[PDB]
Every structure is written in C-alpha cells, then in structure tokens.
JSON list of C-alpha atoms in Angstrom, two decimals:
[
{"chain": "A", "resi": 11, "resn": "UNK", "atom": "CA", "xyz": [162.97, 2.09, -96.84]},
{"chain": "A", "resi": 12, "resn": "UNK", "atom": "CA", "xyz": [162.65, 3.72, -93.40]},
{"chain": "A", "resi": 13, "resn": "UNK", "atom": "CA", "xyz": [165.92, 4.28, -91.68]},
{"chain": "A", "resi": 14, "resn": "UNK", "atom": "CA", "xyz": [165.61, 7.20, -89.34]},
{"chain": "A", "resi": 15, "resn": "UNK", "atom": "CA", "xyz": [164.78, 6.75, -85.62]},
{"chain": "A", "resi": 16, "resn": "UNK", "atom": "CA", "xyz": [161.26, 7.70, -84.80]},
{"chain": "A", "resi": 17, "resn": "UNK", "atom": "CA", "xyz": [160.99, 9.74, -81.65]},
{"chain": "A", "resi": 18, "resn": "UNK", "atom": "CA", "xyz": [160.34, 6.98, -79.41]},
{"chain": "A", "resi": 19, "resn": "UNK", "atom": "CA", "xyz": [163.30, 5.33, -80.75]},
{"chain": "A", "resi": 20, "resn": "UNK", "atom": "CA", "xyz": [164.91, 8.53, -80.27]},
{"chain": "A", "resi": 21, "resn": "UNK", "atom": "CA", "xyz": [163.52, 8.49, -76.56]},
{"chain": "A", "resi": 22, "resn": "UNK", "atom": "CA", "xyz": [164.92, 4.90, -76.40]},
{"chain": "A", "resi": 23, "resn": "UNK", "atom": "CA", "xyz": [168.40, 6.27, -77.12]},
{"chain": "A", "resi": 24, "resn": "UNK", "atom": "CA", "xyz": [168.10, 8.75, -74.22]},
{"chain": "A", "resi": 25, "resn": "UNK", "atom": "CA", "xyz": [167.36, 5.62, -71.92]},
{"chain": "A", "resi": 26, "resn": "UNK", "atom": "CA", "xyz": [170.18, 3.63, -73.46]},
{"chain": "A", "resi": 27, "resn": "UNK", "atom": "CA", "xyz": [172.59, 6.72, -72.78]},
{"chain": "A", "resi": 28, "resn": "UNK", "atom": "CA", "xyz": [171.74, 6.88, -69.08]},
{"chain": "A", "resi": 29, "resn": "UNK", "atom": "CA", "xyz": [171.88, 3.08, -68.69]},
{"chain": "A", "resi": 30, "resn": "UNK", "atom": "CA", "xyz": [175.20, 3.02, -70.48]},
{"chain": "A", "resi": 31, "resn": "UNK", "atom": "CA", "xyz": [176.76, 5.85, -68.47]},
{"chain": "A", "resi": 32, "resn": "UNK", "atom": "CA", "xyz": [176.27, 3.72, -65.35]},
{"chain": "A", "resi": 33, "resn": "UNK", "atom": "CA", "xyz": [177.98, 0.73, -66.89]},
{"chain": "A", "resi": 34, "resn": "UNK", "atom": "CA", "xyz": [181.14, -1.04, -65.61]},
{"chain": "A", "resi": 35, "resn": "UNK", "atom": "CA", "xyz": [184.00, -1.62, -68.15]},
{"chain": "A", "resi": 36, "resn": "UNK", "atom": "CA", "xyz": [183.48, -5.26, -68.05]},
{"chain": "A", "resi": 37, "resn": "UNK", "atom": "CA", "xyz": [179.57, -4.91, -68.69]},
{"chain": "A", "resi": 38, "resn": "UNK", "atom": "CA", "xyz": [180.08, -2.14, -71.51]},
{"chain": "A", "resi": 39, "resn": "UNK", "atom": "CA", "xyz": [182.55, -4.54, -73.10]},
{"chain": "A", "resi": 40, "resn": "UNK", "atom": "CA", "xyz": [180.25, -7.60, -73.25]},
{"chain": "A", "resi": 41, "resn": "UNK", "atom": "CA", "xyz": [177.22, -5.63, -74.16]},
{"chain": "A", "resi": 42, "resn": "UNK", "atom": "CA", "xyz": [179.15, -4.17, -77.16]},
{"chain": "A", "resi": 43, "resn": "UNK", "atom": "CA", "xyz": [180.05, -7.70, -78.25]},
{"chain": "A", "resi": 44, "resn": "UNK", "atom": "CA", "xyz": [176.44, -8.93, -77.80]},
{"chain": "A", "resi": 45, "resn": "UNK", "atom": "CA", "xyz": [175.34, -6.00, -79.95]},
{"chain": "A", "resi": 46, "resn": "UNK", "atom": "CA", "xyz": [178.30, -6.66, -82.51]},
{"chain": "A", "resi": 47, "resn": "UNK", "atom": "CA", "xyz": [176.98, -10.25, -83.04]},
{"chain": "A", "resi": 48, "resn": "UNK", "atom": "CA", "xyz": [173.26, -8.93, -83.31]},
{"chain": "A", "resi": 49, "resn": "UNK", "atom": "CA", "xyz": [174.38, -6.69, -85.78]},
{"chain": "A", "resi": 50, "resn": "UNK", "atom": "CA", "xyz": [175.73, -9.33, -88.20]},
{"chain": "A", "resi": 51, "resn": "UNK", "atom": "CA", "xyz": [172.58, -11.34, -87.46]},
{"chain": "A", "resi": 52, "resn": "UNK", "atom": "CA", "xyz": [170.31, -8.43, -88.79]},
{"chain": "A", "resi": 53, "resn": "UNK", "atom": "CA", "xyz": [172.40, -8.07, -91.82]},
{"chain": "A", "resi": 54, "resn": "UNK", "atom": "CA", "xyz": [171.59, -11.78, -92.49]},
{"chain": "A", "resi": 55, "resn": "UNK", "atom": "CA", "xyz": [168.01, -10.98, -91.87]},
{"chain": "A", "resi": 56, "resn": "UNK", "atom": "CA", "xyz": [168.07, -8.18, -94.28]},
{"chain": "A", "resi": 57, "resn": "UNK", "atom": "CA", "xyz": [169.83, -10.31, -96.90]},
{"chain": "A", "resi": 58, "resn": "UNK", "atom": "CA", "xyz": [167.15, -12.95, -96.76]},
{"chain": "A", "resi": 59, "resn": "UNK", "atom": "CA", "xyz": [164.26, -10.61, -97.08]},
{"chain": "A", "resi": 60, "resn": "UNK", "atom": "CA", "xyz": [166.11, -9.01, -100.11]},
{"chain": "A", "resi": 61, "resn": "UNK", "atom": "CA", "xyz": [166.89, -12.65, -101.49]},
{"chain": "A", "resi": 62, "resn": "UNK", "atom": "CA", "xyz": [163.08, -12.91, -101.45]},
{"chain": "A", "resi": 63, "resn": "UNK", "atom": "CA", "xyz": [163.09, -10.80, -104.74]},
{"chain": "B", "resi": 29, "resn": "UNK", "atom": "CA", "xyz": [173.69, -17.94, -87.80]},
{"chain": "B", "resi": 30, "resn": "UNK", "atom": "CA", "xyz": [176.84, -16.12, -88.66]},
{"chain": "B", "resi": 31, "resn": "UNK", "atom": "CA", "xyz": [178.63, -16.68, -91.83]},
{"chain": "B", "resi": 32, "resn": "UNK", "atom": "CA", "xyz": [182.29, -18.05, -91.76]},
{"chain": "B", "resi": 33, "resn": "UNK", "atom": "CA", "xyz": [183.58, -14.59, -92.06]},
{"chain": "B", "resi": 34, "resn": "UNK", "atom": "CA", "xyz": [182.50, -14.63, -88.44]},
{"chain": "B", "resi": 35, "resn": "UNK", "atom": "CA", "xyz": [186.12, -14.46, -88.05]},
{"chain": "B", "resi": 36, "resn": "UNK", "atom": "CA", "xyz": [184.89, -10.72, -87.68]},
{"chain": "B", "resi": 37, "resn": "UNK", "atom": "CA", "xyz": [183.70, -11.67, -84.24]},
{"chain": "B", "resi": 38, "resn": "UNK", "atom": "CA", "xyz": [187.08, -12.91, -83.02]},
{"chain": "B", "resi": 39, "resn": "UNK", "atom": "CA", "xyz": [188.65, -9.75, -84.42]},
{"chain": "B", "resi": 40, "resn": "UNK", "atom": "CA", "xyz": [185.98, -7.75, -82.53]},
{"chain": "B", "resi": 41, "resn": "UNK", "atom": "CA", "xyz": [186.56, -9.70, -79.32]},
{"chain": "B", "resi": 42, "resn": "UNK", "atom": "CA", "xyz": [190.16, -8.74, -79.45]},
{"chain": "B", "resi": 43, "resn": "UNK", "atom": "CA", "xyz": [189.65, -5.03, -79.95]},
{"chain": "B", "resi": 44, "resn": "UNK", "atom": "CA", "xyz": [186.87, -4.96, -77.30]},
{"chain": "B", "resi": 45, "resn": "UNK", "atom": "CA", "xyz": [189.31, -6.45, -74.72]},
{"chain": "B", "resi": 46, "resn": "UNK", "atom": "CA", "xyz": [191.61, -3.32, -75.06]},
{"chain": "B", "resi": 47, "resn": "UNK", "atom": "CA", "xyz": [189.01, -0.70, -75.30]},
{"chain": "B", "resi": 48, "resn": "UNK", "atom": "CA", "xyz": [188.43, 1.90, -72.43]},
{"chain": "B", "resi": 49, "resn": "UNK", "atom": "CA", "xyz": [185.20, 2.51, -70.67]},
{"chain": "B", "resi": 50, "resn": "UNK", "atom": "CA", "xyz": [184.76, 5.69, -72.56]},
{"chain": "B", "resi": 51, "resn": "UNK", "atom": "CA", "xyz": [185.09, 3.72, -75.96]},
{"chain": "B", "resi": 52, "resn": "UNK", "atom": "CA", "xyz": [183.29, 0.74, -75.02]},
{"chain": "B", "resi": 53, "resn": "UNK", "atom": "CA", "xyz": [180.38, 3.11, -74.01]},
{"chain": "B", "resi": 54, "resn": "UNK", "atom": "CA", "xyz": [180.44, 5.26, -77.11]},
{"chain": "B", "resi": 55, "resn": "UNK", "atom": "CA", "xyz": [180.65, 2.16, -79.50]},
{"chain": "B", "resi": 56, "resn": "UNK", "atom": "CA", "xyz": [177.92, 0.34, -77.47]},
{"chain": "B", "resi": 57, "resn": "UNK", "atom": "CA", "xyz": [175.76, 3.36, -77.87]},
{"chain": "B", "resi": 58, "resn": "UNK", "atom": "CA", "xyz": [176.47, 3.56, -81.61]},
{"chain": "B", "resi": 59, "resn": "UNK", "atom": "CA", "xyz": [175.67, -0.24, -82.04]},
{"chain": "B", "resi": 60, "resn": "UNK", "atom": "CA", "xyz": [172.43, 0.31, -80.40]},
{"chain": "B", "resi": 61, "resn": "UNK", "atom": "CA", "xyz": [171.53, 3.11, -82.69]},
{"chain": "B", "resi": 62, "resn": "UNK", "atom": "CA", "xyz": [172.37, 0.91, -85.74]},
{"chain": "B", "resi": 63, "resn": "UNK", "atom": "CA", "xyz": [170.26, -1.86, -84.09]},
{"chain": "B", "resi": 64, "resn": "UNK", "atom": "CA", "xyz": [167.14, 0.43, -84.26]},
{"chain": "B", "resi": 65, "resn": "UNK", "atom": "CA", "xyz": [168.14, 1.47, -87.76]},
{"chain": "B", "resi": 66, "resn": "UNK", "atom": "CA", "xyz": [168.37, -2.11, -89.07]},
{"chain": "B", "resi": 67, "resn": "UNK", "atom": "CA", "xyz": [165.10, -2.75, -87.14]},
{"chain": "B", "resi": 68, "resn": "UNK", "atom": "CA", "xyz": [163.59, 0.03, -89.32]},
{"chain": "B", "resi": 69, "resn": "UNK", "atom": "CA", "xyz": [164.86, -1.45, -92.52]},
{"chain": "B", "resi": 70, "resn": "UNK", "atom": "CA", "xyz": [163.56, -4.91, -91.59]},
{"chain": "B", "resi": 71, "resn": "UNK", "atom": "CA", "xyz": [160.20, -3.31, -90.79]},
{"chain": "B", "resi": 72, "resn": "UNK", "atom": "CA", "xyz": [160.05, -1.71, -94.30]},
{"chain": "B", "resi": 73, "resn": "UNK", "atom": "CA", "xyz": [161.15, -4.79, -96.17]},
{"chain": "B", "resi": 74, "resn": "UNK", "atom": "CA", "xyz": [158.44, -6.73, -94.37]},
{"chain": "B", "resi": 75, "resn": "UNK", "atom": "CA", "xyz": [155.79, -3.99, -94.86]},
{"chain": "B", "resi": 76, "resn": "UNK", "atom": "CA", "xyz": [156.37, -4.47, -98.79]},
{"chain": "B", "resi": 77, "resn": "UNK", "atom": "CA", "xyz": [153.90, -7.47, -98.18]},
{"chain": "B", "resi": 78, "resn": "UNK", "atom": "CA", "xyz": [152.17, -7.06, -101.52]},
{"chain": "B", "resi": 79, "resn": "UNK", "atom": "CA", "xyz": [151.62, -10.87, -101.26]}
]
C-alpha cells in the first residue's frame, strides 16, 4: 500500500503549516480534536476495507 | 462511528485543554500529515479492485 505523501500532498502540508501558524490557541485546539476524531474514523474505514478479505 | 473505546476522545479532550499554542499547532500538523497518510492507504485498498 501507498503511505508516503505525494508532492502535492507535500505541498498541502506547506499550506497547512502557514494556516496553522496563524491559528489562535482556541482554534488550534478544536481543529486538533476534530482531526483526532477523524483519525479514528479513518482507522475504522481501513478496518472495513481489510475486513473485506 | 467510533467504537466504545471512544473513551479515547474524552481523554484527548482533557489533554488538549491543557496544551500550549505551540503544542496544539505541532500536533495538529502531525494529525493532518497522518490524515493524508491514512487517505493514501484507503486509496490503495480501494485500488485493489480486482472485483
């Protein structure tokens, strides 16, 4: 499986850096939690695709 | 739809409420990197569409 960022995803990380460096404490905190929840949701998506073995 | 062990989210909420700007920013950036990595995995699994 592919795991590395793509160049273009690597570009998107540059954009995320700039955006994040402007963020307030409150805003960084809530986006981290949103991301944290989304991270778990993707594990579940991965588990289902693999369950389809 | 998160498993019961979404006790993890409660824990995470606790930790995040005591993080500094610098750490919230670093971690957020890391998470965003992981999201794309997981996207890549999901893309590969799907691609295996010999079906």
